[PDB]
Design a protein around this ligand. Sequence first.
Ligand code: SAH
Length: 216
Amino acid sequence: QFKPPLYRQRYQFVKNLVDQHEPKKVADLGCGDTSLLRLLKVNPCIELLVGVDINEDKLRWRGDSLAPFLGDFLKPRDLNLTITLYHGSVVERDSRLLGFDLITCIELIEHLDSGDLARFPEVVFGYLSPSMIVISTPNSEFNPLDHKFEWTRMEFQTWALYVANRYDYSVEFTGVGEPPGAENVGYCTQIGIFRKNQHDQHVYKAVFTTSYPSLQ
Ligand SMILES: Nc1ncnc2c1ncn2[C@@H]1O[C@H](CSCC[C@H](N)C(=O)O)[C@@H](O)[C@H]1O
């Protein structure tokens, strides 16, 4: 139904933001397969790539291939690249994720229960407070044409507009997935791109960390 798969369109949407803004530190919350990290590491602008996920099993053996290879030594990077996979939750605050340039929450909020969803903005926007946060979730108005909830365009936009004003951000709405008769349904995936206008807290469990060789 979608020429390139919808999950890949979501990944390419974030890659395009990365290409346009060149963030140095990037964290993907709910990274799952690590498929997004693998796409974003293509870009040489990133100096720190990070992944977080509650599911430790989903991260098993997926770190190994993110480490440098013999090619990366022979033809080296300009600056260091550190990659780190963490076993943790977005609801818990971890100081190693402060000062990031971009945080991505792709198809994650729908997996948060009411209680967890009430704490998510207090952490990602409130505590971490990166320069840019991207949250994507499905549009329930596309369904006629496990998730704890299925929000419409208004429901999401109203939650988003309250958060944007609370934690001092500006939110823009877009998406991926053409309808294509009946164009009024909107995109398949709703996207909100938020743009911003010292105790140690190590909660997460770093499952894998690697660093690349470099030379300027
Ligand atoms: N509280 C939480 N903290 C961190 N990760 C969470 C979480 N609740 C759910 N997740 C993770 O979020 C993911 C949802 S699906 C992963 C989506 C992925 N970015 C993609 O577009 O393919 C799962 O990997 C799940 O384990």
